[PDB]
C-alpha cells in the first residue's frame, strides 16, 4: 500500500489522493506542500559595503622632503607633496616656503555600516529543497512535518513515513552567481573578489566582515592641499554599494520565475510552484479501517446541482447515498478534473449528502470513488463573475467539442466520401 | 607497474608517498642499420606503430 | 607588455616564458605552480559513526504490566515484557510469577567516537581553485604568493601583478557525492542523511557532532532476558560505520585520476595536473631593463655537444656568444620543445658558456632566444638508462621520419605516376 503519487509542486492547497490497498477499507489523503524552502548550496565569497576613506593624518615636515612607502593598508594611497605653507592656528608654522613638506596618506576600509548594512555576493549552486508539509490524515488529522525532496529520505514524524520527490523542476531560480542585501536578493553577475572596478558593484571587496584584508579597487587619488593649509584631498569614487542602492537592479523576489519569495535567513526561495514531485508513503496499517466495517455504498446516484465552472470550490453535487452500515465514507475523485472540499462524508442509513468542489471543463465528467464505489458526476457548469483574490484549488486545467465532432466527422466525411467515389470509378470502370 | 609517460605514484604503507617520472628507456630511433633499430621506436609507441606501420 | 600565456597545469616545475615587450629588454619568467590545491563548494550533509547502545536501564514491575510509550529518543526502541522472575542478588525479587513485568527499552545515541572518529558525508559543487606561485621573477628573483585560478583575479604580493585561469580542465576528481573520514576522502555515494539502511553505511545520520536528533535505522529489536534475569537483550546491526572501516572502497588519494592529492583541511585536492591555465601578468615596468643597455648577442652559433633524449635537464648546447656590452641575457626557447634550466646567463665580451635542457624530439630542432637573437640549436639526442626517480622538467612530448619523407614521397610516386601515366593516354590517343 506505499502509495506512490506524482503530485504537483504547488504550496497553498491540500491533494486529497487515495488510497486504494486492496482488502481495507481505502483511506483519503490530504497533502498539503505548505511550504517549498528550498536552501540551494553556496558560498559567501565576499561581502561588499560602501569604503570609508579613515584618513590618516597627514605627515607634515617643515623643511626637507619624507619618503612615503607603501604600508600594506588596503589601497594604501600615500603621496609626498611639496610647496605648501600650511596655516594651522598660528598662520603658517613651517618656516621654509617650499622645503615645507606634506605627506598625504589614506587607505580605504570597511564602514561600520559593512558590518551590518553590507551586500553580500554568493556562488549558489544548486542544494535541496524542503517542506513543512502538513497532512491532517485519514483519522490521524494531524502531522505538520518539516521534509526533504530526495527520493529516499523519509520523515517519521507523526505515524506515516514519505518519501518526496526528487522534483523534476530542477530551476533554481537563483542563478549561479547572487548578491544579497538584507532581504533584496539580486541575481547578480557580481564581477568577483579582488577585481571590482571602482564606482562599480564591488569596489571593496571584503571576504567577511571580520577579514582585515580585502580588494579595495576605489580610484582614491591624493591630491595637494591647497594654498598651504592642512587638509587631505581624497579624490573617489564615491562606493559602487553607494550605487547599488539607488541605481540598482529589481530584486528576485520581485523578478523572479515561476512564483518563488526569497529570505535572508537560509537563503531559501520559498514556495516555487513548478513540475511535479513524484511522493510515495508508507501509511501504518493500524490507522487503516478493514473493509468490512465501512458500509458499502453503491446502488448510488450522483448529480450536481449548481456547478460553478471556477477556482473556488465552486462546484456541488447531491449524491443519492445507498449504504449498508451507517458512517463515514472517504471520498475522491480519481481523475483530476474535479478536486474536492470533503476528505470525508458521513452517512446514514442511504441518505444524501451534498460536497463542494471545482473543475475546468463545462461538461465535468469525472468519477467519484465514495469508499470503494465509482460514480460519474457528470453535468454542466456555470462561469463566475468576480475574479480578483488569492490563489485557486482547481489547478486543473486541460483541453475542454460542440462543433468538433460532427463538425470533424463532417470535415473527414468529405475526404471519405473521396475513395468511396474513387475505387468505385474502380467498379464502373470494373 | 606499467608506468605511463607522465608518472605514477607509489604508497608503500603509510610510508610517504613515491613518486617516478618514466619517460622512454627503450631508445628513441638512432639509426645505422635499415630497420631493426625501428624496435626503438615501437618500443616507446607500442600502440600507435601496430596500427601505423 | 601585459604578458598572457596559456600554461600547462603541472605543479612541480617552472615554466620560464619570455616578456617580449617592444622597446626595452626581454625578461625571462619562472612560474612554478607549486601548488593546485582545489577546495570546491561542499556541504556539511551530515557525520556518521558507529552508534552505542546505550540502554537506559529497563523498568520491572512485579505484579502486573507497565506499558511503554514511544519516547522521542533516536531510534527509541521499547518493547514491554512479561513472564520474568528476575535473579538479582537474592534469587528473583518479585514475588509474583507471570505478573513479573519487564519494560525493556534502549536508544542509539552518538558514540564518543563520533565527535572524533567519523566519517562524513558532503554534497560537493565546483569551487575554486588556488596556488603558492612562486616566481623567482626576472631580477626581483622572488614571490611565493598564494593566487586564486578565477580569470580576473590579480594578487599583488611582491611587484607583479598577475591574473590566472580559468583553468579549462574542470574535472572535480570529488565527485558530487562524498563521504570523508580522518584522511581517507571517499568519493561514495552516500545514500542520504535520514535514510540509510541498518547496516548500510549510515546507519546513523547526525547532521553534526552537537546536534542531539539523527537519523539511527540500526535495526535495533529488544529481545526479552531470559530465565528470569535482570539483562537487556538488544539485538542489533554492528554499524555501517563498523564496516566501512574494513570492508570498505580505496581512497580517492589511491584511486583519483589526472594526478590529485587529498586533506582533511579544506578538502583542498592539492597538485592536479591536467590542462593548461591562461595565464597573464602585469609586470612592473621598473623591473624592465631598457634594450639599449643589454649586450647585443648575434653573430653566435648554437650548437648541442651531448644531447640527453630525456626528462632530466640532460641536453645540453654550447653557444658561442657573440656580444658587444657583457653582462647578463636572459634565454629562452620560445618553441616549448626545449625546456632549459637556466633562465639568465652571463656575458663576458663575446664568450661561450653552455646551458642545460631537455627535449622529446630526437632532433631538436628548437629556437633559443639569447636576450633578442634567435638561434637553431639544431642536433640529435641520446637515450638515457636510469628511469626510476619523481617527475619530469620535459613535459613536451608530441609528434617525433627517416623512413617517412622519401617513403611516402615515394608511396605518392607510385599514385603521382598514375595522372602522368593516364592523361598521357590521352596525348597517344590525342
Ligand atoms: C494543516 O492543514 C490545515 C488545512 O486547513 C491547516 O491547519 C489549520 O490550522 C489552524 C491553526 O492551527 C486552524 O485554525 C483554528 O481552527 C480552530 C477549529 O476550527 C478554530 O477554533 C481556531 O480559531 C482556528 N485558529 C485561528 C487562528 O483562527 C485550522 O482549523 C486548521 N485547519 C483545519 C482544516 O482544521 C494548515 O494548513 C496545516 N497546519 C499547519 C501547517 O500547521
Ligand atoms: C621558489 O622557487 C624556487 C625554485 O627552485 C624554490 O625556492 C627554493 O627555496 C629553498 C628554501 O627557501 C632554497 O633552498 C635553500 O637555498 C640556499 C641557497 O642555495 C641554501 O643555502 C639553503 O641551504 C637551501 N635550503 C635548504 C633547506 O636546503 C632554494 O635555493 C630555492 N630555490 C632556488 C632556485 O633558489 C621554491 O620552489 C619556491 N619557493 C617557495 C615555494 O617558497
Redesign the interface.
Known sequence: YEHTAVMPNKVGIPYKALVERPGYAPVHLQIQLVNTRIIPSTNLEYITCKYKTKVPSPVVKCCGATQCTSKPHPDYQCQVFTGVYPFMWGGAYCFCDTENTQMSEAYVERSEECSIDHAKAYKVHTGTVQAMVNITYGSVSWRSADVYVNGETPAKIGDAKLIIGPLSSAWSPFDNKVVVYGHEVYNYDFPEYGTGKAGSFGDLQSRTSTSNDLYANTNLKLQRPQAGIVHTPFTQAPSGFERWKRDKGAPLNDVAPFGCSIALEPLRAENCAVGSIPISIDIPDAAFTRISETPTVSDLECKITECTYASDFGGIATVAYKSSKAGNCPIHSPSGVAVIKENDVTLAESGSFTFHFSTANIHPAFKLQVCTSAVTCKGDCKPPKDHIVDYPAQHTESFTWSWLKVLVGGTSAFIVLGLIATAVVALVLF | FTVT???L?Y?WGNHP???????????????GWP?EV?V?YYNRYPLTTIIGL
Chains 1, 3 share one sequence.
Open positions: 609517460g607522465e608518472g605514484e604508497t608517498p613515491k613518486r617516478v617520472w618514466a619517460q622512454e628507456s627503450g631508445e628513441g630511433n638512432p639509426h630497420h625501428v626503438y
